[PDB]
Amino acid sequence: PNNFPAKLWRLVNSPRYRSIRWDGRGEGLLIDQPLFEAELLSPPELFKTTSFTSFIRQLNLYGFRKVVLGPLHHFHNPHFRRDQPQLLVHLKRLT
Amino acid sequence: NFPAKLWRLVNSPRYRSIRWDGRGEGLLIDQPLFEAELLSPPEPELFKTTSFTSFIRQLNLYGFRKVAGNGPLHHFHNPHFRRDQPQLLVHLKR
Amino acid sequence: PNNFPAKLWRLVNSPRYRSIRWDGRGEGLLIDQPLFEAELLSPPPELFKTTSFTSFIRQLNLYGFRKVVLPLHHFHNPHFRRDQPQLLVHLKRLT
DNA sequence: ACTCGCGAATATTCTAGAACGCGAC
DNA sequence: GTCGCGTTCTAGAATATTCGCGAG
Numbered sequence: 085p086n087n088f089p090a091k092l093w094r095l096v097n098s099p100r101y102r103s104i105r106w107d108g109r110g111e112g113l114l115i116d117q118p119l120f121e122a123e124l125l126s127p128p129e130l131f132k133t134t135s136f137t138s139f140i141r142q143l144n145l146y147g148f149r150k151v152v153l154g155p156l157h158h159f160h161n162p163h164f165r166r167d168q169p170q171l172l173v174h175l176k177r178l179t
Numbered sequence: 180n181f182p183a184k185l186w187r188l189v190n191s192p193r194y195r196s197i198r199w200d201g202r203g204e205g206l207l208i209d210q211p212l213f214e215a216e217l218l219s220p221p222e223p224e225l226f227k228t229t230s231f232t233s234f235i236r237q238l239n240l241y242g243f244r245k246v247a248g249n250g251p252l253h254h255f256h257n258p259h260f261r262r263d264q265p266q267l268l269v270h271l272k273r
Numbered sequence: 274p275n276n277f278p279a280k281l282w283r284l285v286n287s288p289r290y291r292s293i294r295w296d297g298r299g300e301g302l303l304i305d306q307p308l309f310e311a312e313l314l315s316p317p318p319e320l321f322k323t324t325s326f327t328s329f330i331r332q333l334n335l336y337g338f339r340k341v342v343l344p345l346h347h348f349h350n351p352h353f354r355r356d357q358p359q360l361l362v363h364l365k366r367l368t
Numbered sequence: 369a370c371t372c373g374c375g376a377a378t379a380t381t382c383t384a385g386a387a388c389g390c391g392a393c
Numbered sequence: 394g395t396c397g398c399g400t401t402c403t404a405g406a407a408t409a410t411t412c413g414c415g416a417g
Contacts, residue, residue, distance in 0.1 A: 085382090088408080131409095132322055132380080138410050144373050145409090177408070181399080226399095227390095232327055233400055239383050240399090273398075276378080321379085322410080328380050334403050335379090366378075367404075 088146060089175035092164070094128040101128060107158060110166030113148075115157040145177050181237055182271045184224060185260070188217075194224070196248075203263065205256035209248045240273045274319060277332055278364045281353070284319065296347060299355025302338075304346040335366050 095101045096113050103119035106112075117136055125134045133139065143159055151158040163171040188197045189206050196212035199205075210231055215221070218229045228234065235253075243255040259267040274280060284290045285302050292308035295301075306326055314324050321329065333348055341347040352363040 085407090133410060135411080140373085141411080142409070150372065179407090228400060230401085235382090236384085236401080237399070245382065323380060325380085330402090331381080331404085332379070340402070368378095 086173075086176060088142060089164070089172050091128055092143075092146075093169070093172060095124070097166075098128060106166050112151055112158055112160035113164070115159070116154075117157060146175050181241065181273075182260075182268050186265070186268060188224060190262075199262055200254065204261065205246060205254055206260070208253040208255070209250065210253060211250045212248055241271050277336060278353075278361050280319065281336075282358070282361065284313070286355075290319070295355050301341055301347055301349035302353070304348070306344050306346060335368075336364050337367065 092113075095104050096106055101124065103116045103123055105114055107114050120139075121134075121136055125131055125136065125139070131139060140157075146161070148159040148161045148164070151160050161175065163174040165171060185197075185206075188194050189199055194217065196209045196216055198207050200207050213234075214231055217224075218226055218231065218234070226234065238255055241257070243257045243260070246254050246256045257271070259270040261267055275283075281293075281302075284293045285295055288294075290313060292305045292312055294303050296303050309329075310326055313319065314321065314326065314329070316324075323329065336350065338348040338350045338353070341349050350364065352360040354360055
């Protein structure tokens with residue numbers, strides 16, 4: 085089972101999780117690290133880690149990278165897109 | 180006997196801790212209530228084990244897969260364990 | 274908080290953690306499961322990340338602990354003995 | 369500097385292999 | 394007497410987390 089991509093989709097898409105959201109084009113995600121730490125690592129639900137760096141490690145394992153051009157983090161994956169949810173099936177850890 | 184016991188348990192409102200999910204395609208188990216009323220002292224349906232992990236082993240052995248009172252809500256599902264299609268129960272094998 | 278063998282040694286030897294202790298001969302450990310869940314699995318300095326006693330059992334077996342052949346659990350490992358800490362070096366994960 | 373992003377060890381999660389006793393034939 | 398079942402204990406394998414750090 086590939087649970088992490090579906091969980092990430094739920095977090096990004098849901099307006100409860102304000103700290104992690106779609107970017108303006110729906111082709112990447114924006115993360116406000118202080119709010120993320122407060123609402124998703126401190127108290128879809130609830131990661132086991134309290135360390136934002138462990139969450140970044142997961143993003144990287146599933147192929148997310150930072151976008152190159154508020155101190156928001158901006159990540160992207162070709163198979164993580166608002167207008168093409170059917171691509172989510174390709175998100176996997178390497179084996 | 181286990182498929183029939185599971186069917187009776189999920190369908191019976193007397194046993195609160197194990198029930199159909201919201202869409203009727205899987206079962207929800209409240210572990211504290213299940214242990215309190217179904218594996219240790221609460222016609223009753225009586226398991227012989229007192230350990231929830233052995234019940235989980237039974238669920239897995241018959242092909243169930245993992246997919247709000249106080250504690251861990253477990254959510255299991257099996258394509259052959261179905262509210263509106265009981266005739267599929269014959270396909271359950273250990 | 275250090276590797277599982279060192280952590281377990283700390284837990285078993287320290288009287289602060291009442292739920293996990295040496296047996297009468299110092300050749301196995303006794304675990305009171307309700308108390309262990311309350312004091313070593315229930316978040317509010319030695320806390321495991323899991324909240325599940327079954328995951329702790331998985332760790333015990335992974336490092337070679339077995340139940341003593343005749344809740345209060347009694348486990349033993351030939352390399353985990355009160356009067357021989359030098360044996361701890363032989364404990365390995367079965368991987 | 370300082371950040372990005374991966375290697376590898378450990379922990380956790382979920383499921384299964386196999387032994388053994390018992391109940392239903 | 395004989396199997397199938399239920400149970401128990403331990404383990405396989407995938408994921409999640411942790412720790413560390415090389416490259417730019």
